Design a binder for this molecule. Structure first.
Ligand SMILES: N[C@H](Cc1ccccc1)C(=O)N1CCC[C@H]1C(=O)NCc1cccc(Cl)c1
Ligand code: NA
Ligand code: NA
Lengths: 28, 10, 251
């Protein structure tokens, strides 16, 4: 989809889940 | 078994 | 999933449960990739050493779920299979090379707060994200240890491991169509997929466009969460050509 991978209860509302920052921090 | 039964329709 | 945590509501809205019609039980995990296509592991459907060979009418897809066992009225949606497509060069005889399959649904599923598809990587997102040390996330309703069952969907974040470490951890022949993930014994942290988590997604959130991509499929491991061992995942991007051919021909 054009909207794939954007979760209604998180990205679509600019809310983060409790552990996605662990992934971000691993991405250099 | 351990699973709640589903609606017969499926 | 072992050493993971309960998922949040709507955390993995592409999560799919493959469910056996009789006896009624969890068969595998899977993922939603469009309103009528579901991706899983081939070994979920075809694995002759264990006398496994499922047909379309043997299974259902349960989408939107959180609880493992409960029927989640007004939230989950339950779908019938139109057709199963297994990779024609899936290697069930030796090492589960090309462990991938597609399932087309009889009717489109309605998206909702709890039901939404994941993205599949393009070559550039794959080259950027599939790097040793970068973490992904694996989700499933499978066993909590090697040998309880969870009440709800479990989640664990795991780092991609360098190919020589993957190769040196096992006597099985590893291919470019796999990658491995997990912590090393000295890293402290642990966690892994386990039985029942087969076919579920390994996802990453792209820091470039902030979308979730499914990079891997839960494929195989020697035991679960053992020190010095790693879980192995189907490399989705490497099999992209096959996925598009199927979707483009059978729509
Ligand atoms: N334990 C076997 C090892 C094996 C690998 C390649 C080919 C033959 C056997 C395995 O994982 N199997 C036997 C066939 C199904 C798969 C499995 O249980 N996968 C589930 C699993 C468990 C732990 C970690 C992961 Cl990533 C996946
Ligand atoms: Na080896
Ligand atoms: Na391990």
């Amino acid at each position: 989809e054009a909207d794939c991978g954007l979760r209604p209860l998180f990205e679509k509302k600019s809310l983060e889940d409790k552990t996605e920052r662990e992934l971000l921090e691993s991405y250099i | 078994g351990d699973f709640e039964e589903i609606p017969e329709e499926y | 999933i072992v050493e993971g945590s309960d998922a949040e509501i709507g955390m993995s809205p592409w999560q799919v449960m493959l469910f056996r019609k009789s006896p009624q039980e969890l068969l595998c995990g899977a993922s939603l990739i469009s309103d009528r296509w579901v991706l899983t592991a081939a070994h979920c459907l075809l694995y002759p050493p264990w006398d496994k060979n499922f047909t379309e009418n043997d299974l259902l897809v349960r989408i939107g779920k959180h609880s493992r066992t409960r029927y989640e009225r007004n939230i989950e949606k339950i779908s019938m299979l139109e057709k199963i497509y297994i990779h024609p060069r899936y290697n069930w005889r030796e090492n589960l090379d090309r462990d991938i399959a597609l399932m087309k649904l009889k009717k489109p599923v309605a998206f909702s707060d709890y039901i939404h598809p994941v993205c599949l990587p393009d070559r550039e997102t794959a080259a950027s994200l599939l790097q040793a040390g970068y973490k992904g996330r694996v989700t499933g309703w499978g066993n909590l240890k090697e040998t309880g069952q969870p009440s709800v969907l479990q989640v664990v974040n795991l780092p991609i491991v360098e190919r020589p470490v993957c190769k040196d951890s096992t006597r099985i022949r590893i291919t470019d169509n796999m990658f491995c993930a997990g912590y090393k014994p000295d890293e402290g942290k642990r966690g892994d997929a386990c039985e029942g988590d087969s076919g579920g997604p390994f996802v990453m959130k792209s820091p470039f466009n902030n979308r979730w991509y499914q990079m891997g499929i839960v494929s195989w491991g020697e035991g679960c969460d053992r020190d010095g061992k790693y879980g192995f995942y189907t490399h989705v991007f490497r099999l992209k050509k096959w996925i598009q051919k199927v979707i483009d021909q059978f729509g």
